[PDB]
Amino acid sequence: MKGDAKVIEFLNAALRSELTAISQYWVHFRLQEDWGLAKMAKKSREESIEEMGHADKIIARILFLEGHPNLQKLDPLRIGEGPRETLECDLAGEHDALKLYREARDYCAEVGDIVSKNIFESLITDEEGHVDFLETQISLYDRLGPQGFALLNAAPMDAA
Amino acid sequence: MKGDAKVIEFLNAALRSELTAISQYWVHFRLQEDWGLAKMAKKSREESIEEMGHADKIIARILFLEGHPNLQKLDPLRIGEGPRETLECDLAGEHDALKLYREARDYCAEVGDIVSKNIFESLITDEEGHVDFLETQISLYDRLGPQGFALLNAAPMDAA
Amino acid sequence: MKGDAKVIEFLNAALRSELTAISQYWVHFRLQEDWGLAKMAKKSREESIEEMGHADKIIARILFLEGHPNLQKLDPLRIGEGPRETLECDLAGEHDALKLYREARDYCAEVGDIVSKNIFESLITDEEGHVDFLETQISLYDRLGPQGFALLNAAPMDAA
Amino acid sequence: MKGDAKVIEFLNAALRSELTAISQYWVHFRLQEDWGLAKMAKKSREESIEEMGHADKIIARILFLEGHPNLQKLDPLRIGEGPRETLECDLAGEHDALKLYREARDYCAEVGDIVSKNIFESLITDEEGHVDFLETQISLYDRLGPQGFALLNAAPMDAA
Amino acid sequence: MKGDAKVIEFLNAALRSELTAISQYWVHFRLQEDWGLAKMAKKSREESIEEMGHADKIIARILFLEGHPNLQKLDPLRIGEGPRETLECDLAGEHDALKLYREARDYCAEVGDIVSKNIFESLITDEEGHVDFLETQISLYDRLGPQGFALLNAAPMDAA
Amino acid sequence: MKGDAKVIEFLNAALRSELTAISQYWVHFRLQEDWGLAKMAKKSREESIEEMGHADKIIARILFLEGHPNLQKLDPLRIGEGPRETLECDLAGEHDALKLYREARDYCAEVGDIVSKNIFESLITDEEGHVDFLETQISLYDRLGPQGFALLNAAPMDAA
Amino acid sequence: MKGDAKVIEFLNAALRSELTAISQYWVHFRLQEDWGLAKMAKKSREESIEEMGHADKIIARILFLEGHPNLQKLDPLRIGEGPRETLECDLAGEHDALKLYREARDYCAEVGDIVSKNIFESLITDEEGHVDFLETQISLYDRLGPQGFALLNAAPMDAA
Numbered sequence A, B, C, D, E, F, G: 001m002k003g004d005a006k007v008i009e010f011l012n013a014a015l016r017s018e019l020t021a022i023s024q025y026w027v028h029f030r031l032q033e034d035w036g037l038a039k040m041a042k043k044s045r046e047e048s049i050e051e052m053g054h055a056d057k058i059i060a061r062i063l064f065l066e067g068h069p070n071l072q073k074l075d076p077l078r079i080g081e082g083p084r085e086t087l088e089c090d091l092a093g094e095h096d097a098l099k100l101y102r103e104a105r106d107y108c109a110e111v112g113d114i115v116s117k118n119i120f121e122s123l124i125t126d127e128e129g130h131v132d133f134l135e136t137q138i139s140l141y142d143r144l145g146p147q148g149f150a151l152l153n154a155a156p157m158d159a160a
C-alpha cells in the first residue's frame, strides 16, 4: 500500500531516534554493570530491548507503506559518566523522542493515516511510561543520596 | 585493567562492523518477510541476533580495558533488492569483517593481549561459519533457480 | 574354527568392497551437505553407517575362521560431482558388490560353509535393497528434473 | 571460501592418518574381543569411533576450503599380535599423528588460517589425551604382568 | 504332512545329539557350581536351556512330518573333571553335532525338504556360535592360566 | 610423554602461585566470615575452590610430561587486615600470577608445546576474569564507602 | 574471645600438619591415577578432602581465639615412588600428626580450654581411623603381593 511520503519521513526519523535509544541504553547497561550496579544495569538492558521492539515494529510499517527503512545513522548519543548522569541522559533522550512523536502523530492524523497515527500514540504512551519511571528514579536518587542509591542498586560479591 | 590503545581501536572498529551487520541482517529479515520468504527471513533474524551478542561481548571487553565503546556510527549498509542480492550483500559484509578480524587478531598476538586475541579468533571462527552457510545457500540458489529457491523458502498462505 | 582358505579370500574381498562403499557414501554425504541437499545427505550418511555394520560383521567372521582381516586398501572410489552423478556412482558400486557377493556365495555353498554362505545371501539381499532404492531415486530424478529433485531434497534456510 | 593449497594438503594427510587410526583401532577391537579381553576391546571401539568423528570434521573443513577430500588410501597399519603389542602399535600411531599435526598446525599459523590452526590444536590435544591413557595402560601392564593385565580386562563366561 | 523317512532319521539323530548336550551342560553347570566357579556355571546353565529349546523345536518338526520322536537314549556323555576339561568336552560335543548337522542339512537339500533344511542351517549357525565362544574361552584360559581363569569366573564368599 | 624441562619449571611455578592463591583466598574467606561479611566471604570461598581446580589441572599436566609436581612451598601470602585490604591483596596476587602466566605462555609457544600453551591461555583468561571482578568491587567499594560496602556484603543476625 | 597463646601455637602447628597432609594425599592421588590404580587414587582424594575440612575447622578456631592462622609453610612432604611406599609415607605422616595432637590435647586440658581440647580429641579419633585403614591396607598389600594388590585397585581400560 503506497504511503504518504511525509509519513514515511517521520517513521524513518522515529526509527533513527529508536536506534539511538537502543545503543544508549545498551552502553549504559554495560557501564552500570562494570560499576557494580547490577540492578540498575538490568533495567537498562530491558529498556534497550524494548526499543529494539519499537524499531522492528516501525521498520515493518515503513516497508508496508512501500518506503525504505534507513538504519544507516543514529542521532547524537548521550553517555553518562556516572549513575545519576545516565538517568539524566536517558531522560533527555526521552523528551526529544516524545517531541518528535507528538509531531509525527499530529501529521498522521492530518493526513488521515489512522494506523500510523496509532503507532505514534502507542510510542508516545510507552515513552511517557519510561519518563514516569526515570523521574521517580531521579527523585529517589536525590532523596537517598549518591551512596544510598548505589547501595540499593548494587549486587553483593556473592551474586548470581 | 588498562589496555593497549590500538587494541581498543581494533575492538571499536569490530564493534562498528558488528553494529552494521546487525542492522543489515534485520532489514533483510523484514524485507524477506514482506516478500513472503518466511524461512529465509527467520534465518536473517537469527544471524542479526547472533551479531547483537558479538557486539555486547566486544563492548564489555572494551570497558574492561578501560576504553570507551563507540556505537555512534555504522559502516556502509548493503541492502539487497531481492532474494539473491541479500545473500550477496551479507556475504560481502562477512568478507570485510573477516579481513578486519584477521588484522586485529594478528595485532593482539603481537602485543601479547591473549584474551582479546582469542575473542577475534572466536569471531573469525563464527564468521567463517556464516560464510560457509551463505556460500552453500548461494550455490543452492543457482542450482534450484530463482523460482525454485523462493519456493523452498516461502511460507504457505495458511502458515503460522 | 579353521576356515576354507578361499572363503577367507572372498570375505576379505567383500570387506574391501565394503570399506570402499563406506568412504564413498560418507564423501557423498559431506558433498551433498555442502550443496544444501540435506535430505539427500542424510540418506547417504545412513547407507554409509549400514556398510560399517556389514564390514564389522565380516571382520568378525574372518577372525572366527582364523583368517586375518585386511583393511589396508580400498577398491577405486567413485565420487560424483553432482546430485545425479552420486546416485550413478553409488549404483555402479552396488552392481560390482552384488557381482562379487553372488560369486563368493556360490563358492561358500560349493565348499559347504553354510554360515558364510548365508552372510553373503544376507549381503546380497541388503544390496538389492539399496539398488531398488537408488533406481527409484534415479527414476524420480529424471521425472522431476534437476531443479525439481534438488528442491525436494533441499533444506530451507531456517532448517535444524 | 578458497583455501591455501598447502593447508588442504595437510588436512588430507591428517585425514589419511585418521582413516588409518580408525581401521587400526577397529581391528584391535575385534582381535581383543576374540581373545576374550572384552574390556580392552570396548575401549578400542570407542577410540575408533572418536577418530571417525575427527575424520568427518576434517573432510568438512576440506570441502569448505574448496579442496577435495581423498579417502582412497591409508598409511601403513600396525596390527599387534597380542594384548601388549596392540597398545604399542596404537601408541606408535599416535606419535606419528602428533608429529604430523604439530607440523600442519605451525603451517596454518604461518599462513594465517586461524580456524584450520585451531582444528589441529584440537586434534593435538585429543591425541595427547590418548597418549596419556596408553602410557598409563602400558605402565599398568608391566606392573600387573601379562596374566594380571589380561585378567583385569577380561570378561567372565557369564558376561553380557 | 508325511515326511521323507530319512529326514526323520536325521531329525531323531539330531534330537539324540541335543538331549546329550542338555545333560552334559547341566552336569557341568552343577559341577562348576560346586567348584565355586559360579560365573562359569551360569553360562553352562544357559547353554543347556538353549539346547532344550532346540530339542523341543526338533521334536515338533518330527511330529509334523508324522514321524515318532525318540528320546529313549543319549549319545556318550563327556564329563570333564576340571574347569578346562569341561570346556574341552563341550567343544568336542559341538564338533560332533556340527558334523551331523551339516550331513543332515545336505540331505534335506537334496530331497527338497526346505523347511527341515533351514532348521539344520539354524542349528549349524547356533552351534558355530557356541564353538566361537568356547574357543575364545579356551584361549583365554591358557592366557590367564588355571588360577587366573578360575579367579575370573569365581564368586566371592558374600555372593548372591 | 617426556616434556620440555623448562615448561615443567614454569608449570611448577604456576602451581606454587596457585597454592598461594588457594590459601590466601581461604584465609580471607574465614576472616571475612568472622567480620560478619558473609556475602563477601562466600565469594572468597568460591575463588579459593576455583584455584584448587587450577592446581589439580596443573599437577596432572606436570605428571603427564613426566616431571615432578612440587607443592612444598608457597609464594609470600598477602593477608588483608580489613575488607578493602583483602580486595587489594587478592588483586595484587592476580597481577603477579598474570605476569607469570604470560611469560610461561610465551615460552610454551616458542618451544611448540601446544597443549601446555593453551593451559596458560586458559589460566590467563580466568585470571583476567577475577581481575575484572575485583576492580569492579574495589570501584564499588570507594563509591559506596566503607560502611555502605560492608552493609551490602553483610548478613543479618537471623541469617542461614 | 582471647585465647591462651600456647593453645594458638598448637593449633597453628596442627594446621601446618594438615596443610602438609592435604598436599601429600593429593599428590598421591594424582600419582596413583597416572599409575592406573584408580581405586587407590579415589581413596587418596577423599582423605585429602577430609584434611581440608580439618584445616578449615582449625583456622576458624584460631580466629575465634583471636590468633592469626598461618598457612605460609608445610612440614616436609613424603611422596612415595610406588603403591606400597605411598601407603608407608601416609602412615608415617599420621603417626607424626597423632604425636602432635596428643601433646596439644594434653596442654588444652591442663589450661582448661575445653572446646579446643575436644577438637584435638576429634582429630585424634579421625587420625586413628586413617591409621586403622592404612594398616589394614598395608597388611592386605603384603598378603596379596605387589601385583595382586595393584590388580585389586586398578581400573579396566573401559572404565568411567
Ligand code: HEM
Binding pocket: A019, A022, A023, A026, A049, A052, A053, A055, A056, B019, B022, B023, B026, B049, B052, B053, B055, B056, B071
Ligand atoms: C546496539 C546494539 C544492539 C545490542 C547490543 C543488542 C543486544 C541484544 C541482545 C543480546 C538480545 C537478546 C535477548 C536478551 O539478551 O535477553 C537482543 C534482542 C533483540 N534485539 Fe537487539 N541489540 C542491538 C540492536 C538491535 C537493533 C537495532 C534491532 C533491530 C532493529 C534489535 C532488535 C532486537 C529484538 C526485537 C530483540 C528481541 C529478541 C527476542 O527476545 O525474541 N536489536 N538484542
Ligand code: HEM
Binding pocket: C019, C022, C023, C026, C049, C052, C053, C055, C056, C071, D019, D022, D023, D026, D049, D052, D053, D055, D056
Ligand atoms: C574403517 C571401517 C570402519 C568401521 C568398521 C566402522 C565402524 C563403525 C560402527 C560399527 C559404527 C556404526 C554406528 C554405531 O556403532 O553407533 C560407526 C559409527 C560412526 N563412524 Fe564408522 N566405521 C568405519 C569407518 C568410518 C569412516 C571412514 C568414517 C568417516 C570418514 C566413520 C565415521 C563414523 C561416525 C561419525 C560415526 C558416528 C555415528 C553417530 O554417533 O551418529 N566411520 N562406525
Ligand code: HEM
Binding pocket: E019, E022, E023, E026, E049, E052, E053, E055, E056
Ligand atoms: C536332562 C535333564 C534336564 C534338566 C536337569 C533340565 C533343567 C531345566 C530347568 C531347571 C528348567 C526349569 C525352568 C526354568 O529354569 O525356568 C528347564 C527349562 C526348560 N527345559 Fe529343561 N531340563 C532337562 C531336560 C529337558 C528336556 C529333555 C527338554 C525337552 C526335550 C527340555 C526343555 C526345556 C525348555 C523348553 C525349557 C524352557 C522353559 C521356558 O522358558 O518356558 N529340558 N530345564
Ligand code: HEM
Binding pocket: F019, F022, F023, F026, F049, F052, F053, F055, F056, F071, G019, G022, G023, G026, G049, G052, G053, G055, G056
Ligand atoms: C594443596 C592443594 C589443594 C588441592 C589441590 C585441593 C583440591 C581440592 C579439590 C579438587 C576441591 C574442589 C571442590 C570439589 O572437588 O568438590 C577441594 C575441596 C575442598 N578443599 Fe581443597 N585443595 C587444596 C587445598 C585446600 C586448602 C589449603 C584448604 C583449606 C585450608 C582446602 C579445603 C577444602 C574444602 C573445605 C573443600 C570442600 C568443599 C565442599 O565440599 O564444600 N583445600 N579441594
